[PDB]
Subunit: 282 residues, 5 copies
């Protein structure tokens, strides 16, 4: 059976207005996040800088995606009477997310493993399996949602969607295994935070499959609005929220190492206005 | 009853000229503010860096909003005689402010609490209640002013406006309570400044509801000009003005801590060409 | 009586070619000054960083104004024969300067007072009176030149121009008074430079009123070219020239303080390949 | 004989959707790479900074190329039915790669020699022969593929392609000779990595000639898609992958020198979460 | 006699393709150069930082010029049949170079004098005479080539070209005199390099007059291609090549001063993988 695609829906001006709000709010919040990332990048040790690098990629790629999308929104719908009607650049208000997620979902996995206690080359097996699994999960979604059937085929959404769901299970079982190994070998205070950051990431990722069910089941401008709102909201929460949580863990670990002799940090580490470690000279 | 919207008004060339001035002046002043923020970002301790991060978000989001708005101004009105007549991209000379305020008003609240003396459960509870309350106040305005009724419904402005006014009261009672707790536990010199910064922020926020009354009551190009002038002016005063006042407080607090042993700062802190603290090595 | 406006003149191709060269040479030279400002910003102390901040805004706002004016030149005139004929975006090749000057003229005043010896009530009173007076002088020009008769009214140029000339006198009497107070309390070497920088600024500001007399008196593409050449040239001289002169004074003062114990600088200060002060550690 | 060019093919919507994905994915991944480069640029000694500089050029040039290409994609094909028919700006979705490769392939050669053990004069002969040979190999490809015959001449692809293949052999024999000389004079641990980085670079370069065989042999939108996919994929692997491998070698060498007295590094060097060297003060 | 101008020639697709290559290659190489400049800016003493500042201006102005030119190329010629036919914005593919050279040729002169041994105020006489002479040489070219006659007048090319050639002689006699004075007072090793850098700059400048002879003598798309190729190539060689040679001299001089007590540098200086100087603390 055939279903209209999400970018083949005429939008009212309450729908058009919300969609521009959330697209522009999401791009804004991720440019804040990018700035924050840069300003706070020296609170973390060089042992834990992979976390900073990940997060900077996540924020750059996502900010660009959202600019593209906001500019395609302006040039993707033509107002006819009281309703905005999609043209051929309307697909460019939706498709560009898959490019963002293609980089970000792998980088979120890398950021999480950044602050775990895996080292050397068994680390590398886990980082690669994660980056693969993550990338394959998005790309197989892209194919169902955008490429094969042109977004308009229920069977192609269900097949490529199911396949994507398998790489979700594989990626999540790799990460959750990595973290379960680490928690014993961290300090109690960090292990606590790393458990929570793992629950926050996996939980965030469960929201995104729901946008894909809408596309299968419901078509309309209401629902095209629902999709954008859901996905925009989830990007803000899961990319501001989670990337601030890993940074606390990096800082706390950095400080723990300072206190222990493992290394020396130029500034002091203050987490929650509690000094974790003092500044030091080589 | 129905009222024409603000972006649905034909502008004379004196009105068009003023509107471009102020939009372009505001974006300019906030790019200065962004630069200033970066250049002075190392005058503050790591204990107080949340203040720098907030202010940088406030300036980035706002600068972008104002670029969008200035570019939409050029492509949103067509000169047809002695009048500039609005296109369908003239909503985009007004609506993008709500996106800015959605990030900024929460970040201004965070910046203010940055330099207060709050820690524990109560700190995080207070930061979240503030960020929520602030965000909800803007968004409920957006809905009245832009989305529901299309800006052209008096009942939708009065209902969504009243609702927004409740989240104003809730947000302001949270912040004013937080600050009232802190002033005892600061030093006299900082407590003085934190009282003043609180009065300057709350007072600034009372200006923005007046732009919203115009939209309810008066329609015309005079009044569309009045709205932009009011809102542009208020952004300059309350974003340049207030974010420079919190930076003095962060600096003064940073220095107070240096002097006290709590921490060490690489450079000396000068506050009104008065040296507050000397430079130090770990 | 009526006069055509400067942006209502048909330019030849010699006139059109010289106006793009000067408009693009001014944005190019003010992007070199933005780079010079950032590369040479740690040669000055933290007692005199209010000068690095003022100059960075004077060069960021000015480069953004000249990019817009060069982009609106490409889309503001149409070649209809051997003549470039103005559109409705031709006002945007002239008007954007008033936005630049609105930020810059106040910031130039701040930069000059940066390196003077004012502190107390008198300092803040002086900085505010200057920033006000400067801003009011430009804005009252904008109204005469762009807004009130559409640039086409001789009485509106002479009235708003006279008013602007009063805020010039007020602003210049404030600054010259501030500097006259400082010169006694500086060192001979700096006092000398601060006198010269004051003469260079006031003298630079006297050029800009001449562009405004042309607009009153003469209309033509020759004269529209004369205006742009005059104003572009003056921006280069007074914004490259003067902002390099204050930086020497900041450096010399920084070094004088180093030598005196007042503070310590990480690098040495070399002014004219002559070493003023050595590097030092806290 | 004549062959249609790759930019003269009508793409289906699945072929346009893939092509936009990969172009946008590649530009995204190279902006991550650029960020990474900047954030990690102080892990390396000043003796080995040429490696950082190379890699930064590689990432900047390539990111820009890919932006151009993504913007030309939007404005290079027009949807006329179920097909995206090529405009005259569809050559600009392919040609800009040759500009990227013209800078990058020489810079990749420089980056590889960066971490080898060459003197500083006989170094120069090798660096120049490499940069020449590399540049000549791309440019002679450009001429066959784009300029002479207009991409549509089989004899011009085979002649200019063969010529390009000779500068490949010359460039690769210079580099492989340089590295074979160095491996003895490195430490075992670095020599190992430098062998692998050499195999990874030469192997990466063998993929790009296959895109050029497609252009000779096969024409279609399938094949225009195959070309972009191949070339995009190879850019990600060989520019993210290889430029991270040289950075490990620079770091390991930097640390080896620290440990040996040759120099001192401000931070510690952690590679695979193993401290290679401690931080130190002059 | 009247000669067609260089932007009044219909380009083939081979000539259009080359022109886009070289414009895009030159802008690319100068963005690399800009990056390089920033990454290596701390290898030089503060005594010699004028060299860094010059070079950064040279790279910024030139990169922007080349972006403008590449964007004007896309929108300056229309494909009509088998030929690209110039529109009225084809002059913007050639004219913008004069703006670049107007800043750069003066800054190249400043960079060269940066590392010579002139100090105080007799330095200033030489720096001003140079910057004047250089600026006047370009501007008088612009007038012959672009403004007077519209590029189409042989007598205006020969008169304004001859005049430009006089300011070349004056500028070169000032610089060569300055350098001849310095070589005695440098160290043998630096004097050697400063002689070579002087020969490389003067020699580079002799290439640019040849583009101007073509414009006088030959008109055609072959020749419009020859002009762009010549000028693009010369920009790459003389702006990458020369600005890397002055940086070696600054570094070598910086190190010589370190070794001598004149100053202290934070990093070590390595030139050709030979440690020139060690890192030091105040
Ligand atoms: C929808 C729009 C919503 C937009 C608002 C988003 C609010 C989140 C931003 C708050 O981000 C805030 O970052 C600072 C870092 O500077 C963190 O603060 C932490 O690090 C700083 C850094 O030196 C330390 O001074 C401090 O002791 C510690 O608490 C906070 O834990 C976090 O809450
Ligand atoms: C219409 C719009 C016109 C806008 C004009 C500009 C508005 C005023 C901006 C002035 O911003 C100025 O920033 C500098 C930043 O160094 C502050 O200066 C502060 O920090 C510096 C740097 O450590 C210290 O030397 C100094 O003692 C302290 O006052 C000033 O307190 C503030 O007045
Ligand atoms: C018409 C358009 C023409 C454009 C030409 C513009 C170039 C002229 C300006 C050159 O600007 C030049 O900047 C450097 C900045 O390091 C200044 O140099 C100054 O700072 C450096 C850096 O610590 C010191 O070593 C030096 O002692 C001191 O002179 C020069 O005094 C100034 O001459
Ligand atoms: C067509 C376009 C092709 C473009 C190719 C450009 C080739 C040259 C680019 C790299 O140019 C190269 O830069 C590095 C910069 O660190 C210089 O390297 C120098 O500084 C580094 C950093 O302190 C030292 O480790 C090193 O000892 C020293 O040689 C080289 O001397 C120079 O040759
Ligand atoms: C298709 C698109 C998929 C995109 C995925 C791209 C991400 C994969 C690459 C991750 O890149 C990652 O960078 C960090 C940079 O700190 C490197 O990390 C390295 O430097 C840090 C910083 O000093 C050290 O703590 C660490 O010991 C060392 O491994 C990792 O070795 C590398 O794995
Ligand atoms: C910052 C962006 C993030 C974390 C994006 C996450 C996206 C997913 C986890 C998507 C998962 C999907 C499935 C498992 C099934 C249906 C298709 C997808 C791609 C939406
Ligand atoms: C920098 C921007 C700031 C501080 C913006 C502030 C905006 C408000 C405080 C808006 C308040 C409103 C009401 C309380 C009622 C009417 C609707 C609003 C959104 C204008
Ligand atoms: C960098 C820009 C500067 C210093 C601009 C200065 C502008 C003025 C000093 C303008 C003065 C004017 C008058 C006093 C009378 C006529 C109108 C003005 C605005 C041109
Ligand atoms: C990051 C980009 C890289 C490494 C690009 C590499 C490109 C080549 C090595 C191309 C080689 C070619 C031949 C040797 C023959 C056919 C033509 C070329 C240009 C594709
Ligand atoms: C990086 C750019 C540089 C060094 C440009 C240099 C340009 C010249 C030296 C031009 C010289 C000319 C003459 C002396 C005569 C003919 C006209 C000119 C402008 C081409
Ligand atoms: C969908 C929620 C998945 C939760 C994953 C995290 C739980 C385990 C944490 C490590 C032990
Ligand atoms: C309308 C869709 C909005 C989706 C927002 C994103 C959901 C993120 C859920 C995070 C859950 C966090 C749980 C943490 C548990 C720690 C113990
Ligand atoms: C008619 C009423 C339409 C209102 C739609 C608003 C949807 C709100 C979704 C949740 C917003 C949360 C945003 C967090 C950043
Ligand atoms: C023409 C309307 C412009 C409105 C500008 C309002 C700016 C904000 C008001 C701030 C009030 C500060 C009070 C400080 C008290 C201590
Ligand atoms: C006809 C006269 C129009 C004058 C408009 C004046 C608007 C108020 C000026 C606010 C100045 C403060 C800006 C920072
Ligand atoms: C027609 C364009 C005018 C350009 C020059 C404008 C700047 C003049 C500055 C005068 C400085 C005098 C210094 C006295 C000491
Ligand atoms: C930095 C610029 C210095 C001044 C440049 C020259 C000013 C006068 C321009 C005159 C050009 C017209 C010549 C026509 C004959
Ligand atoms: C078909 C798409 C393009 C292929 C992907 C890129 C392949 C890169 C080259 C392979 C790397 C070999 C590494 C060997 C290391 C020993
Ligand atoms: C049906 C379309 C399939 C396209 C396959 C493209 C090649 C696999 C993906 C490579 C990703 C590299 C990162
Ligand atoms: C097609 C024209 C290309 C010109 C390239 C730039 C010429 C630069 C000449 C440099 C000469 C070097 C002399 C070194 C002296 C030892
Ligand atoms: C038929 C194509 C002619 C191209 C001429 C190439 C000129 C030299 C290129 C050097 C680039 C650096």
């Amino acid at each position: 059976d055939m279903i209209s695609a999400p970018w083949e829906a005429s939008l009212t001006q309450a729908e058009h207005s919300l969609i521009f709000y959330f697209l522009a709010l999401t791009g804004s919040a991720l440019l804040f996040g990018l700035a924050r990332t840069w300003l706070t990048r020296g609170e973390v040790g060089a042992r834990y800088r992979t976390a900073v690098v990940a997060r900077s990629g996540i924020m750059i790629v996502a900010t660009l995606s959202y600019v593209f999308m906001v500019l395609a929104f302006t040039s993707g719908y033509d107002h006819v009477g009281s309703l905005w009607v999609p043209n051929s650049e309307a697909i460019m208000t939706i498709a560009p997310r898959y490019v963002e997620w293609s980089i970000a979902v792998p980088l979120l996995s890398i950021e999480l493993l950044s602050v775990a206690t895996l080292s050397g080359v068994s680390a590398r097996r886990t980082r690669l399996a994660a980056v693969a699994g993550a990338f394959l999960m998005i790309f197989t979604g892209f194919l169902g949602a955008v490429v094969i059937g042109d977004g308009r085929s229920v069977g192609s959404l269900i097949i490529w969607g199911a396949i994507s769901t398998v790489f979700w299970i594989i990626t999540a079982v790799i990460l959750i295994r990595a973290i379960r190994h680490s928690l014993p070998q961290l300090t109690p205070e960090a292990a606590a935070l790393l458990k929570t950051a793992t629950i926050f990431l996996m939980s965030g990722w469960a929201v995104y499959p729901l946008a894909y069910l809408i596309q299968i089941l419901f078509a309309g401008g209401l629902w095209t609005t629902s999709i954008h709102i859901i996905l925009c909201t989830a990007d803000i929460v899961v990319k501001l929220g989670f990337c601030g949580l890993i940074h606390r863990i990096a800082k706390l670990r950095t400080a723990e190492d300072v206190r222990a002799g493992v290394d020396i940090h130029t500034e002091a580490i203050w987490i929650s206005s509690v000094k974790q470690s003092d500044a030091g000279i080589p």
